[PDB]
Amino acid sequence: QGYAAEISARRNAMDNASKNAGDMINRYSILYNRTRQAVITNELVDIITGASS
Amino acid sequence: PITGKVTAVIGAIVDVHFEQSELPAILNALEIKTPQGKLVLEVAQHLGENTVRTIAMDGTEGLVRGEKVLDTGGPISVPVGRETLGRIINVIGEPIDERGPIKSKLRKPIHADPPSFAEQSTSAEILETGIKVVDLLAPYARGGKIGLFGGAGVGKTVFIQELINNIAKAHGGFSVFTGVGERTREGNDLYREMKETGVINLEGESKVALVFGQMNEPPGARARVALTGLTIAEYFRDEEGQDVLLFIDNIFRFTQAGSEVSALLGRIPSAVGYQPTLATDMGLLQERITTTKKGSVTSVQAVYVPADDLTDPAPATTFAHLDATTVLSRGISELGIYPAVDPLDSKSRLLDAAVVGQEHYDVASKVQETLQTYKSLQDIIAILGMDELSEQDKLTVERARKIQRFLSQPFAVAEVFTGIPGKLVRLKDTVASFKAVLEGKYDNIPEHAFYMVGGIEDVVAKAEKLAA
Amino acid sequence: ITGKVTAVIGAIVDVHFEQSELPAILNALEIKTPQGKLVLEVAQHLGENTVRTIAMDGTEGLVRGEKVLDTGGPISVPVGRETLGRIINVIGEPIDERGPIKSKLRKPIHADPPSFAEQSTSAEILETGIKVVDLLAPYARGGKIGLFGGAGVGKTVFIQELINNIAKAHGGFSVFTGVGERTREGNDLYREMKETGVINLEGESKVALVFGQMNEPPGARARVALTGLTIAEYFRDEEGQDVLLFIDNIFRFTQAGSEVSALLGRIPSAVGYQPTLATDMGLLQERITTTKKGSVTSVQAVYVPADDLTDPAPATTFAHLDATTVLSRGISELGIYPAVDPLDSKSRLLDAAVVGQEHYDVASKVQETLQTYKSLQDIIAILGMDELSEQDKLTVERARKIQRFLSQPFAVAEVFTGIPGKLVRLKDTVASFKAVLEGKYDNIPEHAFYMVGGIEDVVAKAEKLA
Amino acid sequence: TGRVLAVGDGIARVFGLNNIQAEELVEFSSGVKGMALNLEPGQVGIVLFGSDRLVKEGELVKRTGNIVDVPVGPGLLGRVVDALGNPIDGKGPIDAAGRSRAQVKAPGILPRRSVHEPVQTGLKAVDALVPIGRGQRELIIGDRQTGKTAVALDTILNQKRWNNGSDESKKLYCVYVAVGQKRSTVAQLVQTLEQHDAMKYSIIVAATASEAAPLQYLAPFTAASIGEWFRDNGKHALIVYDDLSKQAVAYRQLSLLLRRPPGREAYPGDVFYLHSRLLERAAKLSEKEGSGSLTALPVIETQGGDVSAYIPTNVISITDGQIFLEAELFYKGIRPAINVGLSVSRVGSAAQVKALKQVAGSLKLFLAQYREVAAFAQFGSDLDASTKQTLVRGERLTQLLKQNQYSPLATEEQVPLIYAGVNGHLDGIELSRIGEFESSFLSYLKSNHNELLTEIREKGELSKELLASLKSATESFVAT
Numbered sequence A: 001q002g003y004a005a006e007i008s009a010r011r012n013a014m015d016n017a018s019k020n021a022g023d024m025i026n027r028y029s030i031l032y033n034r035t036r037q038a039v040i041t042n043e044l045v046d047i048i049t050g051a052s053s
Numbered sequence B: 001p002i003t004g005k006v007t008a009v010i011g012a013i014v015d016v017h018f019e020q021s022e023l024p025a026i027l028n029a030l031e032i033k034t035p036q037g038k039l040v041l042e043v044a045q046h047l048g049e050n051t052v053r054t055i056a057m058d059g060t061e062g063l064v065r066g067e068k069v070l071d072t073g074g075p076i077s078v079p080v081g082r083e084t085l086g087r088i089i090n091v092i093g094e095p096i097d098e099r100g101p102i103k104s105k106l107r108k109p110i111h112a113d114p115p116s117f118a119e120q121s122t123s124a125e126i127l128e129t130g131i132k133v134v135d136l137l138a139p140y141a142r143g144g145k146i147g148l149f150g151g152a153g154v155g156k157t158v159f160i161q162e163l164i165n166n167i168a169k170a171h172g173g174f175s176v177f178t179g180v181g182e183r184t185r186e187g188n189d190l191y192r193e194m195k196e197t198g199v200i201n202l203e204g205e206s207k208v209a210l211v212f213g214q215m216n217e218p219p220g221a222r223a224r225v226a227l228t229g230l231t232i233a234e235y236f237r238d239e240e241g242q243d244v245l246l247f248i249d250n251i252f253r254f255t256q257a258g259s260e261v262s263a264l265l266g267r268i269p270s271a272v273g274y275q276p277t278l279a280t281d282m283g284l285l286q287e288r289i290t291t292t293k294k295g296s297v298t299s300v301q302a303v304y305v306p307a308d309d310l311t312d313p314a315p316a317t318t319f320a321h322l323d324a325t326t327v328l329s330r331g332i333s334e335l336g337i338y339p340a341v342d343p344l345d346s347k348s349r350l351l352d353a354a355v356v357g358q359e360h361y362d363v364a365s366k367v368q369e370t371l372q373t374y375k376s377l378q379d380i381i382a383i384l385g386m387d388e389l390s391e392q393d394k395l396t397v398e399r400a401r402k403i404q405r406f407l408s409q410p411f412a413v414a415e416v417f418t419g420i421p422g423k424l425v426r427l428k429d430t431v432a433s434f435k436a437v438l439e440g441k442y443d444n445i446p447e448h449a450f451y452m453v454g455g456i457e458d459v460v461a462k463a464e465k466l467a468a
Numbered sequence C: 001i002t003g004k005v006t007a008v009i010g011a012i013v014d015v016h017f018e019q020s021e022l023p024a025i026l027n028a029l030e031i032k033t034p035q036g037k038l039v040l041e042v043a044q045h046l047g048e049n050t051v052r053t054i055a056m057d058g059t060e061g062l063v064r065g066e067k068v069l070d071t072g073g074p075i076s077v078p079v080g081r082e083t084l085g086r087i088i089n090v091i092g093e094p095i096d097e098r099g100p101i102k103s104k105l106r107k108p109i110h111a112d113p114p115s116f117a118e119q120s121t122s123a124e125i126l127e128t129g130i131k132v133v134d135l136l137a138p139y140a141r142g143g144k145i146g147l148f149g150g151a152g153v154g155k156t157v158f159i160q161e162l163i164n165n166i167a168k169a170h171g172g173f174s175v176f177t178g179v180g181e182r183t184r185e186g187n188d189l190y191r192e193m194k195e196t197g198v199i200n201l202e203g204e205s206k207v208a209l210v211f212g213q214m215n216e217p218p219g220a221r222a223r224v225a226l227t228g229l230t231i232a233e234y235f236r237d238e239e240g241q242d243v244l245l246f247i248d249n250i251f252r253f254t255q256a257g258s259e260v261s262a263l264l265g266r267i268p269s270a271v272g273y274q275p276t277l278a279t280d281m282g283l284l285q286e287r288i289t290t291t292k293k294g295s296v297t298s299v300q301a302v303y304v305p306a307d308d309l310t311d312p313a314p315a316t317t318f319a320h321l322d323a324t325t326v327l328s329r330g331i332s333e334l335g336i337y338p339a340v341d342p343l344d345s346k347s348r349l350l351d352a353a354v355v356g357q358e359h360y361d362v363a364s365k366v367q368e369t370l371q372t373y374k375s376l377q378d379i380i381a382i383l384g385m386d387e388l389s390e391q392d393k394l395t396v397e398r399a400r401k402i403q404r405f406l407s408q409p410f411a412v413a414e415v416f417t418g419i420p421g422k423l424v425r426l427k428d429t430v431a432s433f434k435a436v437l438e439g440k441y442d443n444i445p446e447h448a449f450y451m452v453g454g455i456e457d458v459v460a461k462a463e464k465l466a
Numbered sequence D: 001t002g003r004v005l006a007v008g009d010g011i012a013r014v015f016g017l018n019n020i021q022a023e024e025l026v027e028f029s030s031g032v033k034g035m036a037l038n039l040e041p042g043q044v045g046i047v048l049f050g051s052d053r054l055v056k057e058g059e060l061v062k063r064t065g066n067i068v069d070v071p072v073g074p075g076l077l078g079r080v081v082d083a084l085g086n087p088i089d090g091k092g093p094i095d096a097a098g099r100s101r102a103q104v105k106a107p108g109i110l111p112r113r114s115v116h117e118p119v120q121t122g123l124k125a126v127d128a129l130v131p132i133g134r135g136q137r138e139l140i141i142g143d144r145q146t147g148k149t150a151v152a153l154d155t156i157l158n159q160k161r162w163n164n165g166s167d168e169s170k171k172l173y174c175v176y177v178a179v180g181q182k183r184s185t186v187a188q189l190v191q192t193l194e195q196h197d198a199m200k201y202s203i204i205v206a207a208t209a210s211e212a213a214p215l216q217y218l219a220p221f222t223a224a225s226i227g228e229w230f231r232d233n234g235k236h237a238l239i240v241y242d243d244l245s246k247q248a249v250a251y252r253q254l255s256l257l258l259r260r261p262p263g264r265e266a267y268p269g270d271v272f273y274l275h276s277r278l279l280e281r282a283a284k285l286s287e288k289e290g291s292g293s294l295t296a297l298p299v300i301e302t303q304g305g306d307v308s309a310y311i312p313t314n315v316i317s318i319t320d321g322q323i324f325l326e327a328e329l330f331y332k333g334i335r336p337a338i339n340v341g342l343s344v345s346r347v348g349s350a351a352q353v354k355a356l357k358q359v360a361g362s363l364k365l366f367l368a369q370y371r372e373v374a375a376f377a378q379f380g381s382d383l384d385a386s387t388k389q390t391l392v393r394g395e396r397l398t399q400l401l402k403q404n405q406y407s408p409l410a411t412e413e414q415v416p417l418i419y420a421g422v423n424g425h426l427d428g429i430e431l432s433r434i435g436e437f438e439s440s441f442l443s444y445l446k447s448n449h450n451e452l453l454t455e456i457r458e459k460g461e462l463s464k465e466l467l468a469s470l471k472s473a474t475e476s477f478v479a480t
């Protein structure tokens, strides 16, 4: 009985872990997009400053 | 006539010097005769000293300083009217189908003002496409902008041709298809498939006029070709009082061509590299697509999303103008459901009780709820079998599957490739059918009696034939 | 032909020639100063008889209107056997205080790459005596070898051990170029090479030294690589020798090019590098080639800023190399020196037609084992090795043994270790790794493979532990 | 004529040259050439093809009158030429049918035809799962040293089968473009092609690393102009750009030293219009226009595998598909290391050989299932029988798609192997010896069932009886 309960509990625990991992993936995907845009903008500003003198 | 001389050739940018007070206004088209025909320069700036800076709509290679330039006296002028139907047109309005000249009585500037605030429609309203899923769950705005998402292998082209056919049959309005910066090969495939389908018909009447500026065109042509197509559509609106369709594939490349053009003129690029004029450059195109007292132009815009980043300034700016979205999905195609429109990702601002009416809104909301609950149950339904859920869950799963199958529809254009007769289903019967399905009036019917049929009458007929 | 200085801005000096015959670009100009002659290299013609030049020495103390002499050609450095065992700066003057270089000839540092018809192809494998290199990335005689690595991963120790193993045995003369590196390490190298008899202050010697260390202006750090390259070219084309051209550090050539480009006012490219990065690197690199007159082998240490191999400088360098030995911080933090990345390091010659099918098979199986182990590490970090299948357990354990077996005690490292250095033959390396792959030493504990020589040392150390 | 005002960074500003055309060639008194990219009200910005040491202020410049153009014709076959068509192999002068400009408009909407003929890439993976059609433009994209040039070179080498024949409608002439590669690599490529007798139908346009930026910029365009001769005269051609990243770098150099406005990653604003102008010239022409075609295989290098970079994004947008090579697979021993999930040919099945289409249809499904189930291999202690069998089959299919370099297989040699793999006959064979199976199986067929191979080659289809015979042969072999 303890074995059956433990296997079911581990199943549910890994389900919860997968939910949480998906949520974290969404958060850091948003953060990655923001950082990508920021990097492009800052490097382009540097290039423009070098060009405009 | 008024004639200047070229003085500087830098890439696709050409400077032209005119004698005193002869200057062409901005956006004017200037013509240079070359062995390859006319090269058209669009005026972009006045540099003083009676000099203007202009964008070349074709390759500047071979130009010499002092090459004389003739001012046409107005913006790029393109032919309009029914003589354009079935023809292929480039940005400057010349035919590229080699069927000869476009003998239209009129020519119209591609640059024109949007309708004034007093001329706008006071109320939003639905344009029925004759497609059950679209008209139920993502109703199109009359004179609005509809973003189309998808790609290869999801039936996008046949869906577009079905829109062209259904709008023409139901509402009598012609269509204009614009290829903004997309592959030449895909444009040829579209032309061939349209001739096969019959929306283009060289021997007789045809339903769509085509404008193409391909990837190999300079940035300026890829920028202005969308306005060329829009200008053809606006004529059918204003002068013939029709509910026209304007397809734009791809709007992202309108934005990208605008970015390139802004970079060439030396303007300081804005965030993540896009043009500083991004928002108003988009607005000048989008705000001409609107309903007026005489008719409307409804735009279906295939929108690419770079890096799948919905926050990128290009898709971010584009979505501000979209009234609805149609999401073609390969997942739905793998279910065998065509047109393969995703019932839940497809969304519309107009799916609101005050616009469509409370009955339609109730039916659509319950269809969405049924499909969403089924989607949430799917994994446990697979694991435990459909019988393991409650009686209400099992009922809703069966009804959800029947509804999902019922959202399929045989298109009159695809009939050529499949033999199955097409169906054009108007909105009242669609609402009635899905309402009756939600009320369980047809729950005893087998699932595949709902597959590839018209309204509920065809459901009854097919169930009868399957019972016999 | 003489002119006058008109503008001094940092390392950039403008000169004006009233005589209306300007020096051609890359010409050397000379200014007499209390510190000797200051050498300027012409970089541009600005119009109105004005030329813009890059200083090879400190410009402080320059005065407007100061007279400048045109040498009539590019920076000219002494060549030939008279330069062996002597240290030369970029402008070609000795800095070892042993008096003038007696060369019969001085030649320009700027010259054309050999034409296409002159190119000669060689597949001669260069045995280094290093297990990981000889196995997974064998070097090519007449080719280019790149030691990629960030700060403190071991490029200097590795290249010193390479000098020990190769330069002693290779019959042909060598040239070592300190392009803008640390003077401390250059002095250490000079002392070591005097100790080991590669340099000799009496009689014959077989390495020529060029140094442009990093305290010098950007232009000197740019042109010192060409100064060394020209002596290597003289040994190749005019003596018919097979030549070794050791270079550290190529990243300094790129960085000095960036500095001079920025000073000249060129619009900076991505992450600030000069627009001409790719063509500058090409002009430097593909002068270093094996013509039908002789072969110029080159070993090139490349600093990788922020350990980022995607940076435009390493990324540009990679395209020119026949064998890459990518040092890795991660491998070093495991303690596995010399810390070459067994997977990122790659060689043009690791082909069964060149090294034979047995060597190729052993190398390929080692790569497969290490890559499988790396893939499984992602799971082991969570669940350990207990959950893995017995096949997976066995392959992971053999992978760990192999990974530690790639380590080797260098002689140069006897200041960083007490272990006597050892040199392992290629044949013995192949035999050892074949034996480990086949599982003949599954019964050996992992630590017996650490910092040992061939498999014989594995057996001996396993017994010593037991 | 004109007088040089200033010289630097490989750019020469010239007073005069009033009648010069944009992009026209000019000859300096020292003999070095350039092309007039910038026309300005009082000066011309020439980009030099040689080192600027050869040009100094006040020098006289001669106008050539010719826009940049290159010799074209079949006389180039078997020759190595620079970007301007000057021979560099050291052999005799280039005999040419004519001379054509570097830059010309791609064929319009009407003259083209839908791609319907295969480009016989001799690689099992490419031919079976991501096929290429004549007139298609298929990206080869990947990281440093991942086998990209190996894939293109195997595609070039496989044509040896048909280019010996008499039927010009099947023969495929190959153009290879070396941009930014060191001359030693091009020399070894030439020796590799001569070793396999592949030069008699190949052309190599080389703009190597030290050659000035303008030549690296022009080389793809001029090589495409070489291919367009075959295209327009009804013959079939294949052009490999190796690689477009370095062409973009050279164009960035030109633009920045001309001080044209930069853009993202400091590239000029219209860098998209470079590769779109270059690649849209690949086309399949209709019967009226001569039925010819020009297939393009642009190579692209992604730093760290970043496909989101500017130039990779542009080229991925422009092309009809991609063959994606991943270093992780290369290290595992899966070579030529094609990542099947990311690799897509949007023209796809229409170009594929019918006999190969019949058997390879399900290979895609099985490999997709294997890719989904791969994570379970580390948990083999409890596998659902479906997952276990899926893993067993997918492992052997992946092992079968491995292929040695310079070893292209004929279509009738690929069909039996993929048939055996798909239909599960390999399940009884130990994985470690799948490589022994394939070479053995073919050697069996070509001695015991050569009728089947000949029929597959001649007809190109697996008729039902022929398919049953193939099954019988496969089982007759696997029994031993």
Ligand SMILES: Nc1ncnc2c1ncn2[C@@H]1O[C@H](COP(=O)(O)OP(=O)(O)OP(=O)(O)O)[C@@H](O)[C@H]1O
Binding pocket: C319, C347, C348, C350, C351, D142, D143, D144, D145, D146, D147, D148, D149, D150, D151, D301, D335, D336, D403, D404, D405
């Ligand atoms: N199918 C294969 N089997 C074995 N080795 C291969 C195979 N394909 C490529 N290689 C090896 O991979 C290495 C790199 O191959 P290749 O030169 O084609 O790469 P590339 O991606 O074009 O590289 P680069 O970025 O340097 O141009 C070479 O050693 C080549 O021998």
Ligand SMILES: Nc1ncnc2c1ncn2[C@@H]1O[C@H](COP(=O)(O)OP(=O)(O)O)[C@@H](O)[C@H]1O
Binding pocket: C149, C150, C151, C152, C153, C154, C155, C156, C157, C158, C337, C338, C408, C409, C410, C413, C416, C417
């Ligand atoms: N064979 C070796 N044994 C132990 N440590 C080594 C060995 N080779 C290099 N190292 C390590 O490398 C470090 C110095 O590397 P060095 O080459 O000076 O850095 P750089 O990469 O800047 O040249 C030392 O801390 C030393 O421990």
Ligand SMILES: [Mg+2]
Binding pocket: D148, D149, D150
């Ligand atoms: Mg390559």
